[PDB]
Amino acid sequence: YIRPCYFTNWAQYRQGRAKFVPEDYTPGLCTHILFAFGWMNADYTVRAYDPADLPNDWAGEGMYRRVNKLKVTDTQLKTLLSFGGWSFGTALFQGMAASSASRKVFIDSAITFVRTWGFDGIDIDWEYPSGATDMANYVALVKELKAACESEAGSTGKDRLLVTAAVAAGPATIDAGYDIPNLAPNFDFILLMSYDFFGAWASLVGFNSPLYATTELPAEWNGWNVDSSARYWNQKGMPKEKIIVGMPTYGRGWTLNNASAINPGTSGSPAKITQYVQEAGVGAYFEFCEMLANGATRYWDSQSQVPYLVQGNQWWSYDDEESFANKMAYVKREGYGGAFVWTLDFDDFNAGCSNSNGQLYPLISVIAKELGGVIIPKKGG
Numbered sequence: 001y002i003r004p005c006y007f008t009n010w011a012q013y014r015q016g017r018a019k020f021v022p023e024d025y026t027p028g029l030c031t032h033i034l035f036a037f038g039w040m041n042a043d044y045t046v047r048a049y050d051p052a053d054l055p056n057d058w059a060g061e062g063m064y065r066r067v068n069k070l071k072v073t074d075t076q077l078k079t080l081l082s083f084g085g086w087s088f089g090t091a092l093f094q095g096m097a098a099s100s101a102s103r104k105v106f107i108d109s110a111i112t113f114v115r116t117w118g119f120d121g122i123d124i125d126w127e128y129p130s131g132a133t134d135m136a137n138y139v140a141l142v143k144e145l146k147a148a149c150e151s152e153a154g155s156t157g158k159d160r161l162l163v164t165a166a167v168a169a170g171p172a173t174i175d176a177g178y179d180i181p182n183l184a185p186n187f188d189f190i191l192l193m194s195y196d197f198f199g200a201w202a203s204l205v206g207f208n209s210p211l212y213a214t215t216e217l218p219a220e221w222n223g224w225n226v227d228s229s230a231r232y233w234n235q236k237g238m239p240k241e242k243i244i245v246g247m248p249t250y251g252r253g254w255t256l257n258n259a260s261a262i263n264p265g266t267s268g269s270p271a272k273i274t275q276y277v278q279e280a281g282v283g284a285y286f287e288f289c290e291m292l293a294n295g296a297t298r299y300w301d302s303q304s305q306v307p308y309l310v311q312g313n314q315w316w317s318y319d320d321e322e323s324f325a326n327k328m329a330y331v332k333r334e335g336y337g338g339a340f341v342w343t344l345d346f347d348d349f350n351a352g353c354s355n356s357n358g359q360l361y362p363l364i365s366v367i368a369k370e371l372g373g374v375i376i377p378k379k380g381g
């Protein structure tokens with residue numbers, strides 16, 4: 001079972017208990033660490049996102065080496081350099097993928113870059129390719145990228161670089177952007193972004209990552225859930241061993257319009273900002289645990305098999321130990337390739353919740369143990 005985890009190189013800048021560096025990783029937590037993110041130049045060459053990624057005078061070894069140095073104490077761990085994300089937008093992807101020669105510049109620059117900095121593969125999180133032009137250029141990029149990685153491996157004798165992508169879970173996005181049959185043979189696996197189905201961008205109070213649909217939400221959304229999107233990628237021609245189910249350690253929240261209307265499918269505006277994530281409508285597991293300690297009421301959605309909590313006018317959809325174990329039993333029963341996490345930094349990665357029994361990574365640990373057979377230690381002696 002492939003169990004990748006996203007490392008974000010800006011989580012080191014969060015405050016106090018939220019500060020996350022690679023040294024907070026613990027062996028066997030993941031089989032793959034995706035480094036979010038690598039960056040691009042206007043000419044589509046590759047560069048570091050953060051100067052602190054490279055060995056420097058101020059931070060020292062730098063985040064690339066500090067993440068890759070994790071492979072000495074986790075001897076089966078592989079790393080990948082990810083490109084894109086939502087903040088990256090699409091204008092630079094659209095230009096880079098526009099021609100054989102613009103793609104090759106990125107492809108050659110990227111393969112060189114990852115071999116220089118110790119990564120075992122290249123992850124494309126273009127969010128999102130859209131339309132016939134994009135759809136064909138995206139298929140050309142992944143085929144040409146894999147083609148170059150095979151060559152480089154053939155020439156060098158090294159194990160071939162991995163070629164993955166974080167991909168959309170929404171049916172309309174999936175249709176407008178991805179020629180799956182022409183993509184599947186050139187991908188090692190895809191990180192299915194089976195979350196952000198509902199969110200503060202809209203008034204519809206819903207679930208970030210419902211495993212199944214619920215009749216509490218209007219039928220028009222029956223496809224916006226983990227099970228439907230994974231099936232959709234399988235049905236369009238991605239093999240299951242390549243579909244890695246996405247797992248959020250963050251949650252999405254709302255300021256209710258009516259404090260006594262607390263059911264899924266009510267209406268609201270973005271949630272109040274939380275202390276450490278500092279993004280309205282988003283919040284981390286280590287923040288939700290404190291809400292539960294400070295009086296929030298925990299609810300379980302039986303149809304969608306995920307929790308929500310309510311505290312005053314604050315309504316939060318999130319994931320916990322129960323929803324994680326239910327999604328992992330889901331992954332095994334249905335035979336998908338494994339599960340990945342967005343992100344390591346939103347789990348209670350240091351058993352720092354006031355409520356914590358000491359378990360490091362209470363959420364991600366369930367994936368190590370239920371998919372990997374790995375027991376993550378408790379903090380302390």
Ligand SMILES: CCCOc1ccc([C@@H]2c3c(-c4ccccc4O)n[nH]c3C(=O)N2Cc2cccnc2)cc1OC
Nearest residue numbers: 006084085086087088125166193196199201277279342
């Ligand atoms: C669909 C709209 C959801 O809104 C999102 C906004 C941003 C990201 C996230 C992100 C950020 C970012 C980081 C910390 C705090 C605020 C931010 O806006 N910077 N780059 C990225 C990124 O790619 N994100 C999404 C992502 C990429 C790959 C895999 N999983 C998630 C995410 C949002 O949800 C997508």
